[PDB]
Structure formats: structure tokens, C-alpha cells
Enzyme design. Structure first.
Site, PDB file in Angstrom:
ATOM      1  N   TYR A   1       3.091   9.160   3.486  1.00 43.75           N
ATOM      2  CA  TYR A   1       4.339   8.670   4.067  1.00 43.75           C
ATOM      3  C   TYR A   1       5.344   8.068   3.068  1.00 43.75           C
ATOM      4  O   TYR A   1       6.533   8.113   3.354  1.00 43.75           O
ATOM      5  CB  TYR A   1       4.062   7.619   5.150  1.00 43.75           C
ATOM      6  CG  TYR A   1       3.464   6.351   4.597  1.00 43.75           C
ATOM      7  CD1 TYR A   1       4.255   5.332   4.130  1.00 43.75           C
ATOM      8  CD2 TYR A   1       2.099   6.179   4.559  1.00 43.75           C
ATOM      9  CE1 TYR A   1       3.695   4.188   3.573  1.00 43.75           C
ATOM     10  CE2 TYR A   1       1.542   4.996   4.029  1.00 43.75           C
ATOM     11  CZ  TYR A   1       2.365   4.045   3.510  1.00 43.75           C
ATOM     12  OH  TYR A   1       1.856   2.845   2.968  1.00 43.75           O
TER      13      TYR A   1
ATOM     14  N   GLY B   1       0.797  -1.186   0.000  1.00 40.00           N
ATOM     15  CA  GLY B   1       0.000   0.000   0.000  1.00 40.00           C
ATOM     16  C   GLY B   1       0.837   1.246   0.000  1.00 40.00           C
ATOM     17  O   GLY B   1       2.055   1.175  -0.119  1.00 40.00           O
TER      18      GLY B   1
ATOM     19  N   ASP C   1      -3.416   9.517  16.206  1.00 36.26           N
ATOM     20  CA  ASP C   1      -4.014   9.258  14.889  1.00 36.26           C
ATOM     21  C   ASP C   1      -4.565   7.864  14.831  1.00 36.26           C
ATOM     22  O   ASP C   1      -4.436   7.177  13.774  1.00 36.26           O
ATOM     23  CB  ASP C   1      -3.030   9.546  13.759  1.00 36.26           C
ATOM     24  CG  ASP C   1      -3.702   9.865  12.435  1.00 36.26           C
ATOM     25  OD1 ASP C   1      -4.915  10.117  12.324  1.00 36.26           O
ATOM     26  OD2 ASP C   1      -2.916   9.912  11.423  1.00 36.26           O
TER      27      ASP C   1
HETATM   28  O1  LIG Z   1       3.625   1.176   9.738  1.00 35.40           O
HETATM   29  C1  LIG Z   1       2.851   1.332   8.779  1.00 35.40           C
HETATM   30  N1  LIG Z   1       2.379   0.333   8.026  1.00 35.40           N
HETATM   31  C2  LIG Z   1       2.664  -1.041   8.161  1.00 35.40           C
HETATM   32  C3  LIG Z   1       3.729  -1.497   8.951  1.00 35.40           C
HETATM   33  C4  LIG Z   1       4.001  -2.843   9.058  1.00 35.40           C
HETATM   34  C5  LIG Z   1       3.178  -3.737   8.360  1.00 35.40           C
HETATM   35  N2  LIG Z   1       3.155  -5.089   8.344  1.00 35.40           N
HETATM   36  N3  LIG Z   1       2.125  -5.572   7.587  1.00 35.40           N
HETATM   37  C6  LIG Z   1       1.438  -4.543   7.120  1.00 35.40           C
HETATM   38  C7  LIG Z   1       0.197  -4.735   6.318  1.00 35.40           C
HETATM   39  C8  LIG Z   1      -0.753  -3.726   6.225  1.00 35.40           C
HETATM   40  C9  LIG Z   1      -1.900  -3.956   5.496  1.00 35.40           C
HETATM   41  N4  LIG Z   1      -2.162  -5.108   4.888  1.00 35.40           N
HETATM   42  C10 LIG Z   1      -1.251  -6.084   4.997  1.00 35.40           C
HETATM   43  C11 LIG Z   1      -0.053  -5.940   5.673  1.00 35.40           C
HETATM   44  C12 LIG Z   1       2.063  -3.307   7.613  1.00 35.40           C
HETATM   45  C13 LIG Z   1       1.837  -1.939   7.477  1.00 35.40           C
HETATM   46  C14 LIG Z   1       2.436   2.680   8.305  1.00 35.40           C
HETATM   47  C15 LIG Z   1       3.129   3.121   7.001  1.00 35.40           C
HETATM   48  C16 LIG Z   1       3.784   4.434   7.355  1.00 35.40           C
HETATM   49  N5  LIG Z   1       3.904   4.409   8.805  1.00 35.40           N
HETATM   50  C17 LIG Z   1       4.351   5.554   9.487  1.00 35.40           C
HETATM   51  C18 LIG Z   1       5.731   6.055   9.118  1.00 35.40           C
HETATM   52  O2  LIG Z   1       6.498   5.320   8.515  1.00 35.40           O
HETATM   53  N6  LIG Z   1       6.051   7.304   9.501  1.00 35.40           N
HETATM   54  C19 LIG Z   1       5.118   8.346   9.947  1.00 35.40           C
HETATM   55  C20 LIG Z   1       4.812   9.279   8.795  1.00 35.40           C
HETATM   56  N7  LIG Z   1       6.038   9.788   8.163  1.00 35.40           N
HETATM   57  C21 LIG Z   1       5.761  10.673   7.084  1.00 35.40           C
HETATM   58  C22 LIG Z   1       4.473  11.163   6.924  1.00 35.40           C
HETATM   59  C23 LIG Z   1       4.146  11.995   5.869  1.00 35.40           C
HETATM   60  C24 LIG Z   1       5.088  12.371   4.940  1.00 35.40           C
HETATM   61  C25 LIG Z   1       4.663  13.186   3.749  1.00 35.40           C
HETATM   62  N8  LIG Z   1       5.467  13.182   2.699  1.00 35.40           N
HETATM   63  C26 LIG Z   1       5.025  13.860   1.618  1.00 35.40           C
HETATM   64  C27 LIG Z   1       3.842  14.547   1.587  1.00 35.40           C
HETATM   65  C28 LIG Z   1       3.118  14.534   2.749  1.00 35.40           C
HETATM   66  N9  LIG Z   1       3.502  13.867   3.852  1.00 35.40           N
HETATM   67  C29 LIG Z   1       6.405  11.881   5.083  1.00 35.40           C
HETATM   68  C30 LIG Z   1       6.756  11.041   6.156  1.00 35.40           C
HETATM   69  C31 LIG Z   1       7.075   8.773   7.929  1.00 35.40           C
HETATM   70  C32 LIG Z   1       7.310   7.926   9.137  1.00 35.40           C
HETATM   71  C33 LIG Z   1       2.730   3.726   9.338  1.00 35.40           C
END
Ligand SMILES: O=C(Nc1ccc2n[nH]c(-c3ccncc3)c2c1)[C@@H]1CCN(CC(=O)N2CCN(c3ccc(-c4ncccn4)cc3)CC2)C1
Ligand SMILES: [Cl-]
Length: 351
Positions: free
Chosen positions: A30, A26, A143
């Protein structure tokens, strides 16, 4: 092609040779999340590519996610298994964060099927169990919503996405009416729109209550179409605030706005959710209080009769120590934040 950089939906995921056979999961603001095969551990994992270095705000969210998740360790909170990035600061454009692979998330699951009362109750229990740990470090998630609750094939649930997380700071909670807010609209407590920056634990309890409602009915309880509409949605169900609750709001514009609206009595939860368990609705009622001071705490919620099959305070661990994040972090230039991200990720070097 040997040594190739694998592409996911046109995005290079340069994570070989340890990680290969990338498959899209997906994407969002982020970055993008994929699964991969880890040739060291001989298992598939999740890897997300984050590329935040053009903007200070993206760097704040990246640093916050990393700093919290590298320290937390709890069954109901997603961990970090590894982090890949370039060997020099100048070369670093991307951070790849490797995490346990789960099967789905609660958003996907609630689109797909109605849950039994058993599953609603047990998912709720795990959300609260994770949140007790998070709150015990004085961390606010800020969130919580179905897409941030990851679920595996044995119905284990893990909370993810700490990019908007902060520390409880009641001294600085106050703000004006209609203050812009970054967290997801539909899960915002009413006070966010009135007088609150979301710096107390009650903010997360509200979102949990929204999640419970959504598990009961398979639709969001308060789907506002714009900022003020969200408050109006809330007030349509909770009814007019009492005089005591109004007297806790001294922002003139907020007060005058609330006092202009039509008088309405609280809509009975049993009328909104006529096929739901009475104990679930009692707990829902306690989570979705208009006044944040009157809202149930995480420990109280765990002890509620609805959760009695699972409640076990000997098996609901807390954090080692609270955390601190000073507001002045929010004013650091992006290259200083980049240096911090470089430092925090150093102990996973080299690749
Ligand atoms: O941890 C996260 N997702 C995960 C994790 C482990 C998984 N294991 N399995 C799955 C899975 C999900 C669904 N179906 C099957 C399997 C996982 C999904 C999400 C993805 C992103 N995360 C947060 C994150 O990495 N950060 C917070 C937000 N941040 C951020 C936010 C916005 C922007 C941004 N950039 C450009 C424009 C606007 N905003 C840049 C960085 C980066 C660090 C939460
Ligand atoms: Cl106020």
C-alpha cells in the site's frame, strides 16, 4: 531546516506545515504509515502515504478504501480524519490519509504475549461489533487478519484496510476450482479454493474464526505455504466434507479433487485447544464451518454465550444505508479512477 520535506525511511512525506515530526510506523504494498504531530489539533496522528497512480489495480484499492471509510463512522472501524493531496490532478502523485493513532495491532500483540481469556473474549466482541456495522451496509471486508485489527492502550480495537472490500453479491459468487484470489492466504475460507469469489458475508466470518483460533494459540490455525496447501490445511482439521456438503459443489474439478483425498474425521477443537474455554471453542466451531451456508452470522455470533459480558444489542449500531459498487468500476481506466479519488478527496482541500 524550516519548511523541509520530512523523510521517512527515504520517502518524502510532504504534509507540512500542518503535520510535522514524522516517525515511521510500518509499510507494505500500500505505501508507508507514519505518526505525525498535528499542529491544529495538537496531538499525534497516523498518516499513510499512498502512491497508486501507475496502475489501475492500485487505484481501485485506493478509491475503495477512501469511499468506504469516508462514509463509515463506528467505534470499531478506523476513520479518516483528513486527506492531503495536490491542488491539481496533474500534480497529484500521492494521497496522504490521516487517521487516529493507535498503539499496536493484533499481529504485533500476539507475537509479544499470550492473551488472557478476558482479552480474547473482549477483542472478539469488538471485531464482531465492528463487523456487524460493516455487514449492515452490505460491505464485505474480505481481508480480516490480525495485522488489520488496530489496538490502543485502553484495549479499544478498530478494524482497518478496506482495499479489497466489496458488496455482498450472492448472484455472482460462483467461480471455478483454484481461482486466483487476492486476499491473504491463511485467512481464506475453503470455498475460495473450490467455487467462491468471496462475495457473501460468510467470507468474513471464516476469517474471524481464524483470528479467534490464533488468539487462543498464538499461531495461525491454517498457515498454507501455497494456494492449494491452504485448502489442504483446512481439510486436515475439518476433515472430509460430508456428502451433503459435497452435493453443494458441482464444479467437476473441485469435486473430483475432494473425492480423491483420504477419508478423515473432523479433529475435535478441544484436542487442538486443550486449555481454551469451552464456549470460545463452541463459537470457533460455528465460525469455521466448511459449508458457508451453515456458518454463523455476525448477529448470531454476538449473541453467543461466550460474549455475554459484552453483548448489548442497544449498543451495537448499524449503518445508515447499504452501499453499492458496480463491477464496471473495476474496468474503469486508471485516469478515471484518479479523477474519482480527486473528487472524493476534494472536501479536505485546500491544505
Ligand atoms: O489503515 C492502515 N493502517 C493504519 C491506520 C491507522 C493507524 N493508526 N495507528 C496505527 C498503528 C498500527 C500499528 N502500530 C501502531 C500504530 C495505524 C495503522 C493500513 C495501511 C494501508 N491501509 C489501506 C489503504 O490505505 N488502502 C488499501 C490498499 N491500497 C493499495 C494497496 C496496494 C497497492 C500496491 N501498490 C504497489 C504494489 C502493490 N500494491 C496500492 C494501494 C491503498 C489504500 C490499511
Ligand atoms: Cl460449485
Amino acid at each position: 531546516v524550516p519548511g523541509e520535506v520530512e523523510m521517512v525511511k527515504g520517502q518524502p512525506f510532504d504534509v507540512g506545515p500542518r503535520y510535522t515530526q514524522l516517525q515511521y510506523i510500518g509499510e507494505g504494498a500500500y505505501g508507508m504509515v507514519s505518526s505525525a504531530y498535528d499542529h491544529v489539533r495538537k496531538t499525534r496522528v497516523a498518516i499513510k502515504k499512498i502512491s497508486p497512480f501507475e496502475h489501475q489495480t492500485y487505484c481501485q484499492r485506493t478509491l475503495r478504501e477512501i469511499q468506504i471509510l469516508l462514509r463509515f463512522r463506528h467505534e470499531n472501524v478506523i476513520g479518516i480524519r483528513d486527506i492531503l493531496r495536490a491542488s491539481t490532478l496533474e500534480a497529484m502523485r500521492d494521497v496522504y490519509i490521516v487517521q487516529d493513532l493507535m498503539e499496536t495491532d493484533l499481529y504485533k500483540l500476539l507475537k509479544s504475549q499470550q492473551l488472557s481469556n478476558d482479552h480474547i473474549c473482549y477483542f472478539l466482541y469488538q471485531i464482531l461489533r465492528g463487523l456487524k456495522y460493516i455487514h449492515s451496509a452490505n460491505v464485505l471486508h474480505r481481508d480480516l487478519k490480525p495485522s488489520n485489527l488496530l489496538i490502543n492502550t485502553t484495549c479499544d480495537l478498530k478494524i482497518c484496510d478496506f482495499g479489497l472490500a466489496r458488496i455482498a453479491d450472492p448472484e455472482h459468487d460462483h467461480t471455478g476450482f483454484l481461482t486466483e484470489y487476492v486476499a491473504t492466504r491463511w485467512y481464506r475460507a475453503p470455498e475460495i479454493m473450490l467455487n467462491s469469489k468471496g462475495y457473501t458475508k460468510s467470507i468474513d466470518i471464516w476469517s474471524v474464526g481464524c483470528i479467534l483460533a490464533e488468539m487462543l494459540s498464538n499461531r495461525p490455525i491454517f498457515p498454507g505455504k501455497h494456494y492449494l496447501d491452504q485448502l489442504n490445511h483446512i481439510l486436515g482439521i475439518l476433515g472430509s466434507p460430508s456428502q451433503e456438503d459435497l452435493n453443494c459443489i458441482i464444479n467437476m474439478k473441485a469435486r473430483n479433487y475432494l473425492q480423491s483425498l483420504p477419508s478423515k474425521t473432523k479433529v475435535a477443537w478441544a484436542k487442538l485447544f486443550p486449555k481454551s474455554d469451552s464456549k470460545a471453542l463452541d463459537l470457533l466451531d460455528r465460525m469455521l464451518t466448511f459449508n458457508p451456508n451453515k456458518r454463523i452470522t455476525v448477529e448470531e455470533a454476538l449473541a453467543h454465550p461466550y460474549l455475554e459480558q459484552y453483548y448489548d444489542p442497544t449498543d451495537e449500531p448499524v449503518a445508515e444505508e447499504p452501499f453499492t459498487f458496480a463491477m464496471e468500476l473495476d474496468d474503469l481506466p486508471k485516469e478515471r479512477l484518479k479523477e474519482l479519488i480527486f473528487q472524493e478527496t476534494a472536501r479536505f482541500q485546500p491544505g
